[PDB]
Amino acid sequence: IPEYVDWRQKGAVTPVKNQGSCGSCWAFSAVVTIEGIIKIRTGNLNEYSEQELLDCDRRSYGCNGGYPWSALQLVAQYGIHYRNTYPYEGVQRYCRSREKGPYAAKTDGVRQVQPYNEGALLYSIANQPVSVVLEAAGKDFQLYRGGIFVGPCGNKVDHAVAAVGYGPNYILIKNSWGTGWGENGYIRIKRGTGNSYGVCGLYTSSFYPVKN
DSSP: OOSOEETTTTTOOOOOOBOOSSOOHHHHHHHHHHHHHHHHHHSOOOOBOHHHHHHHOTTSOGGGOOOHHHHHHHHHHTOBOBTTTSOOOSSOOOOOGGGGOSOSBOOOEEEEOOSSOHHHHHHHHHHSOEEEEEOOOSHHHHHOOSSEEOOSOOSOOOEEEEEEEEETTEEEEEOSBOTTSTBTTEEEEEOOSOOTTOGGGTTSOOEEEEOO
């Protein structure tokens, strides 16, 4: 794999979004990977509906939290609609997929990255955007405003985001707190420190969608 990867430059990342005050970070994370893999396979970049996952994934808790892996399997089992047809509301409602018509896209499956292994995760990112978790509760993360972030932070993950590239000393992460946070909405987290948890527990739980 190359020394640098940035899916943004390859036209596979859509604009940064703001989840607002609704704990839907699991859904936003999932969508970034779906937007990613559809672009890689068909050449076309489209935005997909976070709202649809928020309302339909029965294993998840709507604005109270959820699991990016549950979302991804829903996209594999059923499909997902375009963001335009099923726009983000910032609160859980009821599943309206039925009244939106045919799904815009469908994946074939989900795969998990081997955890606590920097190399395995870099290898996946080199193939496509990946959904990852990290500890975002600490003030340093919340006030992050740029630079390569080294912490401080522990490993009590509580936030799902998406990894969209890397370089010699960092991993590139797209957050869903809008553009006024971090580097226009992104963060560069330090890698290569030799801690198997990863900085802020970044290597704990990573999943990516498969489409043939």
